[PDB]
Design a protein around this nucleic acid. Structure first.
Lengths: 121, 25, 197, 108, 216, 80, 86, 129
RNA sequence: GCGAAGGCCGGGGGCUAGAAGGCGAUCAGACACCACCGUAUUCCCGGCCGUAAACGGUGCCGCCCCGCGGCCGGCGCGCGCGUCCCGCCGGCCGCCCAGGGAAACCGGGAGGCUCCGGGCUCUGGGGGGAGUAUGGCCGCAAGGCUGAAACUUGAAGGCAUU
RNA sequence: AAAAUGGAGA
C-alpha cells in the first residue's frame, strides 16, 4: 500500500476542509484538475500534487460517507449544529417522571416543601 | 557462594592450627 | 430559597442520586444512603449551593474571563447553553495539557475563576489551575476527590439531565443577581436543549 | 532496592509455611512463592470429542471433567512462560491477561 | 525589545499599572517574563555571579553527549534574590539560559532584626532553614556586633541578598554547590513564610489591587 | 459545617466508644423485666454476667450471653 | 500599628505584608503560586441585586489540597455574614 | 508508656493546628500543662480553652487563634542559672523578638523574658515558638 | 527458659528422597550439572548443639495522624429482618494525602525533628587484617560465645540516570 | 546438548 507523511496529508486536509468548495467525492478526474488554481496551493511536480490529489478522493469520500474527525466543511458548516440548537416535540422534557421511594420522599421532606403532598404521581 | 567457601576454608585453617599447637608442645 | 416547580424539576431530572461510595467532605450535602444504596442527596442543600456559586460569578471583573472546561460527552450540550446566556469563555474538549502554564499554546485561557465539569475527569485541569493561582470552583459527586477544589455543586453529575439542570440553575442564578433573565418570573428557556440524543 | 512489597509471597501474620515441589523444576517452593494456577480441562482432547460423543453407548453421557492444580516453581514459570516479567506500572496489575474464560487447559 | 507582553500580568507591567515587584508578590503571582521582573528595577540593578559550570557527559550508544550546566545567583541589595541554572552545549547559551532562570524566580528577603531596630535591618528576622536534597542550611539572626558568618560560596549569596550579618550552620554535601546555594535560597523563601506576632492581623479583604482584576 | 468539640454532640456520642467520648460514661443500663405469671419486678443489667431467676420460679429468667441478656418470659422494656 | 516588620519607631520598616490567608490565619506565602482569592457578592432584599461590592476571602492551596476549603469557605462566609441559617 | 504529658499535649496541639483544626483534645489535664496553656493564651498564641472533667485524668478542649508556629518540651527538666538564660534563648528560640521559654521559679511560673528580668532562673519545662 | 534445618550422643525404626560412595552418559575435564543405584540421614524416644537471608534486612513500650476499600475476632445500630446496613473495632492489610527520606521508597511509618530533647535496652564509626591471633567460657566433638593488634591503602559501599 | 581465555597503561 501507500502511506504518506503528515505534511502531505495535512496539505490535503487543509485543501479538503479549509477550501472545500466542491472537491469531488467519488471521482478522481475533477480532483486531478481542481487542485491547480495556483492560489489554492503551490508545490512542484505533477505527481507531488497527485499525492494530495490521491488522499483528497478518500477524504471527500469520507466526508460524503459521514462527518470526519473535527469536520469543518467550508460549504456546509451549519449542518446538524441546528439539531443541537433544536428542541424536540414540544420541549416538554419535564413532568411526571415520579420514581420516588420513601427515602427519596424523605430527601424532599428534609427541605421545607413536602412535594406532591408526600404522594408523588 | 564465596562467603561459605571462605568461612569453611577459614575453619579448615583454624583446625590445622590446633593440631600444630598441641602436637608441637 | 427554593421554588417547588423547579425543585420538583431537579427530583425528576436525575438530580436525586450519587455514587454508592462516599467521602467525609461530601457527607453534609448527602442526605444519606437509602436501601437502594446509591446515596440520595438533600434538595435544599443543592439550591443553596447554586446561589453561593452565583455570587462568585457576578464578582469577576470580566464576565467573559470565567472559563468552564468540559472533558466529558454528557457535559457538552449543557456547556453550550452556558455560553448562549452567560458570557464565560468556554474551554471545551480534552484539556490539551498545560494550557494555563503554556501561554504560547494556542487555546491558553487565563480564567480569573475556573469551572470543572466532573471532579475525576479534570485531574490535570485543577492542578494546572493551581500552577496559575486560579481560584478553583467545580461540580462534585457524592464521592469525589476535592483536591485543589475550593467550592463545588452537589449533584448526580453522572447523567446529562442532572448536568443540564446544573448549568441551567447556575445560569439562572447569576442572571437573577444581574436582575435580567426572570426576576420572580418564568425563564423563556424550557428544560430541553440540556441533553444531546 | 526492595523489588516487590509482597516479596513474592502473600505471607501476612506468619513465619513459615509448607513446601510444594514444582511439577517441572521438582524444586521445593514454599506455598507462598508458587504460581498455583487452577486449571479445568476435559479428559479427552477437544478434536476427538465429537467421535467419542458419537460413540455415546450410555444415554446422556458427558465428557470426564478433570479438576487439578498446577504449581510451577518461579524459574519453571518464566522459562515455560506461565507468567512474564513486567514493568513497574504493570507490576501491580492483579489480573491474568488475554481474557480466555474458555474451559480447557489449552486456552482455545 | 518592545517585547509583546508574553504574560497577562505582562500587559500590567507594560502599562506601568504594576506598581513594583512587591505588589505582585503580595498578591502571590507567577512572573513569567525577564522583562516583567526588569520593569520593577532595570539598568545595572542586581550584580551577577556565575560558578560551577559542571560538564555532565551522558553515556549513550557512541560518544557521551558532553553538555554544560552552570548556576546564576541574582544580587539586588534591596531585599530581593533568586537562584537559577541553565543546561546547554555552548558555554554562552548555558550561562545565558541560567541568567534567565534566576531572573524568573525573585523572592523578597524579610530584612529582620535582633536587639537594635532604630536603624535599617542588619540580619534576617528568624533562623532560615533551607532543605535542598542532602544540604540543609541555617541562617540564625546575628546582632550587628557579629559579621556575615558564612562559608565562602554561601556568603556571596547572602551578600547579594544584602543582609549585612548572619550566623550560618550547614549539614549535607556542602562541597556540592548546587544543593548548597539552592538551600540558602530556599531558606530565603522561608523569610516571609513564618507567621510572626507582628504579622498577625484580621482585615485586608480590600481586593482592589487584585493583579488579575487589574487590566487595561 | 458547624460542629463543636467543646459542647459535645449527643447523637454521635452514642456511636462513639464508651471511653472515646468527651466523658467516659457507662454504655449499658438496668432493665426491669415482667414475668408473665406474676408482677414481681427483677432489675437486670443490659449485659448480664450472672443469671437472675424470677422470684417464685427457680428457672433463671436470664441465661447470660456475651452481651444482651434474653428472657424466657415476656420482656418489660427498660424501666416502664 | 503598622502590621508587618516594623522599626523601633513602630512605623513599617518592611512595607511588604503578605496578606494572612483569612481561613487558616496562616499567611499567604510570597511564592504561594497556588494561592486563591475567592470573592462573593452581597444582595439587596426582594431584588437580590448585586451592589458591586463583594467580600473577598483568601485560601492557600494547602487548604485546597485538604479539600476542606469548601466546608471552611461556608463557615468563613458565616464569619463574613454571607452564610444564612443553613 | 506515657511519661511526658506536655509532649503528648504539645504535639497534640501542634499537630491539630497543622491540619488547621482549632478545637483539639488532650488525654490528661495537668496543673503544669495549665501553666503552659495559660501562658500561651496570655502571650496570645492560643485561644479560649476548657477541661471537660471526669473524675479521672480529664480531657482538655482548646479553641485556637490558628497562629501557633511551633511548641515543644525539653525532657526532662534541666535547671539553668539566671546567668545562662540567654544561651538557651539562642538555641531554642527563633529570634529575640518572639522568644518565650517556659521556666519554673519557686516565686511563680513565668516565661523566660519576665524571669531573667526578675533575676531568677529555674528549669526549662518546654519550648514556645 | 526456649530456638528451623543440618550436626552429634545412645537406643528404636527404616516407605520415599538422599550429604558420601559407586556407576553410566556428557564434555579437551566432568571431579560436576543430568540418568541409575545407593550408606549416613530423614521418622520416634531420651540427652547435647544453640546457629540461619532466625529478614519486615525495621528492638520494645507510649502519643498524634488523611482519606479510600477489603479479611478475621467479638460487640452493639436501626432496618421488613436479609451473615441487611452502620459504627465499637482488637488484630490482617492493600493502595496512598501532607510530612519525611542520598535515593529506593515509607506513610496501622521509615512521619510529627538542623523549628534537631516521651521513656528504656542494644548496636555502629573508611575498606582490609579478622571473626583472625591470645586468654576465658561452653560443647562429647563439630563448632559456639567473647574478642585485639602488627601491617596495608584510597577508596570500599548506598540508592538511583543513560 | 556443548559453549574456555582476552596481557599493562588512555
Amino acid at each position: 500500500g501507500k502511506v504518506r507523511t503528515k505534511t502531505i496529508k495535512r496539505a490535503a486536509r487543509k485543501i479538503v476542509e479549509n477550501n472545500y468548495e466542491s472537491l469531488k467525492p467519488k471521482d478522481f478526474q475533477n480532483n486531478k484538475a481542481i487542485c491547480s488554481k495556483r492560489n489554492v496551493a503551490i508545490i512542484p511536480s505533477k505527481r507531488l500534487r497527485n499525492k494530495v490529489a490521491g488522499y483528497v478522493t478518500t477524504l471527500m469520500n469520507r466526508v460524503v460517507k459521514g462527518p470526519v474527525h473535527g469536520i469543518s466543511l467550508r460549504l456546509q458548516e451549519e449542518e446538524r449544529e441546528r439539531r443541537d440548537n433544536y428542541a424536540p416535540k414540544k420541549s416538554e422534557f419535564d413532568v411526571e417522571n415520579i420514581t420516588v421511594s420513601g427515602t427519596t420522599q424523605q430527601m424532599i421532606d428534609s427541605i421545607g416543601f413536602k412535594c406532591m403532598s408526600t404522594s408523588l404521581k | 557462594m564465596r562467603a561459605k567457601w571462605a568461612k569453611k576454608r577459614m575453619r579448615k585453617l583454624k583446625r590445622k592450627r590446633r593440631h600444630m599447637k598441641a602436637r608441637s608442645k | 430559597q427554593l421554588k417547588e416547580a423547579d425543585v420538583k424539576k431537579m427530583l425528576v431530572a436525575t438530580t436525586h442520586l450519587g455514587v454508592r461510595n462516599i467521602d467525609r467532605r461530601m457527607q453534609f450535602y448527602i442526605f444519606d444512603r437509602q436501601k437502594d444504596g446509591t446515596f440520595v442527596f438533600n434538595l435544599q442543600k443543592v439550591w443553596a449551593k447554586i446561589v453561593f456559586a452565583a455570587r462568585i460569578l457576578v464578582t469577576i471583573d470580566d464576565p467573559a474571563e470565567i472559563a468552564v472546561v468540559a472533558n466529558r460527552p454528557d457535559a457538552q450540550r449543557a456547556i453550550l447553553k452556558f455560553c448562549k446566556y452567560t458570557h464565560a469563555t468556554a474551554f471545551p474538549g480534552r484539556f490539551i495539557p498545560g494550557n494555563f502554564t503554556n501561554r504560547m499554546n494556542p487555546n491558553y485561557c487565563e480564567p480569573r475563576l475556573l469551572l470543572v465539569n466532573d471532579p475525576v475527569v479534570d485531574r490535570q485541569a485543577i492542578l494546572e489551575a493551581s500552577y496559575v493561582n486560579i481560584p478553583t470552583i467545580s461540580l462534585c459527586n457524592s464521592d469525589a476527590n476535592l483536591k485543589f477544589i475550593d467550592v463545588a455543586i452537589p449533584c448526580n453529575n453522572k447523567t446529562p439531565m442532572s448536568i443540564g439542570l446544573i448549568y441551567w440553575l447556575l445560569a439562572r442564578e447569576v442572571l437573577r443577581l444581574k436582575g435580567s433573565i426572570s426576576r420572580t418570573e418564568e425563564w423563556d428557556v424550557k428544560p430541553d436543549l440540556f441533553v444531546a440524543l | 532496592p526492595v523489588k516487590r512489597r509482597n516479596n513474592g509471597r502473600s505471607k501476612y501474620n506468619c513465619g513459615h509455611t509448607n513446601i510444594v515441589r514444582c511439577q517441572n523444576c521438582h524444586r521445593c517452593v514454599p506455598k507462598d512463592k508458587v504460581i498455583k494456577r487452577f486449571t479445568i480441562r476435559n479428559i479427552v482432547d477437544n478434536t476427538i470429542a465429537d467421535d467419542v460423543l458419537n460413540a455415546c453407548v450410555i444415554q446422556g453421557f458427558a465428557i470426564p471433567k478433570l479438576y487439578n492444580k498446577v504449581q510451577y516453581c518461579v524459574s519453571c514459570s518464566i522459562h515455560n512462560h506461565i507468567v512474564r516479567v513486567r514493568s513497574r506500572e504493570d507490576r501491580k496489575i492483579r489480573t491474568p491477561p488475554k481474557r480466555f474464560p474458555r474451559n480447557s487447559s489449552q486456552k482455545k | 525589545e518592545e517585547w509583546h507582553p508574553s504574560t497577562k500580568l505582562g500587559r500590567l507591567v507594560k502599562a506601568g499599572k504594576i506598581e513594583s515587584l512587591y505588589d505582585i508578590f503580595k498578591y502571590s503571582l507567577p512572573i513569567k517574563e525577564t522583562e516583567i521582573i526588569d520593569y520593577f528595577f532595570p539598568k545595572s540593578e542586581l550584580a551577577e555571579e556565575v560558578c560551577n559550570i559542571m560538564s555532565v557527559q551522558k553515556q549513550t550508544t557512541a560518544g557521551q553527549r558532553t553538555r554544560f550546566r552552570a548556576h546564576v545567583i541574582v544580587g539586588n541589595r534591596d531585599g530581593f534574590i533568586g537562584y537559577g541554572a541553565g543546561v546547554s552545549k555552548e558555554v554562552a547559551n548555558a550561562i545565558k539560559k541560567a541568567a534567565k532562570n534566576a531572573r524568573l524566580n525573585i523572592v523578597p528577603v524579610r530584612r529582620g532584626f535582633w536587639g537594635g531596630k532604630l536603624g535599617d535591618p542588619h540580619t534576617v528576622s528568624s533562623k532560615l532553614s533551607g532543605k535542598c536534597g542532602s544540604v540543609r542550611v541555617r541562617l540564625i539572626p546575628a546582632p550587628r556586633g557579629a559579621g556575615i558568618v558564612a562559608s565562602p560560596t554561601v556568603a556571596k549569596v547572602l551578600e547579594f541578598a544584602g543582609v549585612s550579618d548572619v550566623f550560618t550552620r550547614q549539614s549535607g554535601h556542602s562541597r556540592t554547590l548546587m544543593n548548597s546555594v539552592g538551600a540558602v535560597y530556599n531558606a530565603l523563601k522561608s523569610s516571609y513564610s513564618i507567621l510572626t506576632p507582628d504579622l498577625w492581623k484580621k482585615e485586608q479583604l480590600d481586593h482592589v489591587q487584585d493583579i488579575r482584576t487589574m487590566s487595561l | 459545617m458547624n460542629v463543636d468539640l467543646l459542647y459535645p454532640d449527643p447523637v454521635e456520642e452514642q456511636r462513639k466508644h464508651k471511653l472515646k467520648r468527651l466523658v467516659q460514661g457507662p454504655n449499658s443500663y438496668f432493665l426491669e423485666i415482667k414475668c408473665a405469671g406474676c408482677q414481681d419486678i427483677v432489675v437486670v443489667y443490659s449485659h448480664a454476667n450472672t443469671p437472675v431467676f424470677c422470684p417464685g420460679c427457680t428457672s433463671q429468667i436470664s441465661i447470660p450471653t456475651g452481651g444482651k441478656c434474653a428472657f424466657t418470659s415476656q420482656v418489660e422494656r427498660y424501666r416502664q | 500599628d503598622d502590621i508587618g516588620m516594623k522599626n523601633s519607631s513602630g512605623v513599617v520598616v518592611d512595607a511588604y505584608i503578605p496578606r494572612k490567608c483569612s481561613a487558616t490565619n496562616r499567611l499567604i506565602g510570597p511564592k504561594d503560586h497556588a494561592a486563591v482569592q475567592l470573592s462573593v457578592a452581597r444582595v439587596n432584599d426582594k431584588g437580590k441585586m448585586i451592589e458591586n461590592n463583594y467580600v473577598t476571602f483568601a485560601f492557600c492551596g494547602a487548604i485546597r489540597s485538604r479539600g476542606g476549603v469548601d466546608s471552611a469557605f461556608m463557615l468563613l462566609a458565616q464569619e463574613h455574614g454571607l452564610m444564612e441559617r443553613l | 508508656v506515657r511519661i511526658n504529658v506536655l509532649r503528648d499535649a504539645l504535639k497534640s496541639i501542634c499537630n491539630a493546628q497543622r491540619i488547621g483544626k482549632k478545637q483539639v483534645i488532650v488525654r490528661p489535664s495537668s496543673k503544669v500543662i495549665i501553666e503552659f496553656l495559660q501562658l500561651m493564651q496570655k502571650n496570645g498564641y492560643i485561644s479560649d480553652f476548657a477541661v471537660v472533667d471526669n473524675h479521672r485524668s480529664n480531657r482538655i478542649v482548646v479553641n485556637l487563634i490558628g497562629r501557633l508556629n511551633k511548641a515543644g518540651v525539653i525532657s526532662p527538666r534541666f535547671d539553668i542559672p539566671a546567668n545562662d538564660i540567654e544561651k538557651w534563648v539562642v538555641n531554642l528560640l527563633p529570634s529575640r523578638l518572639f522568644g518565650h521559654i517556659i521556666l519554673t521559679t519557686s516565686q511563680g511560673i513565668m516565661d523566660h523574658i519576665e524571669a531573667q528580668h526578675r533575676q531568677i532562673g529555674g528549669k526549662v519545662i518546654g519550648y514556645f515558638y
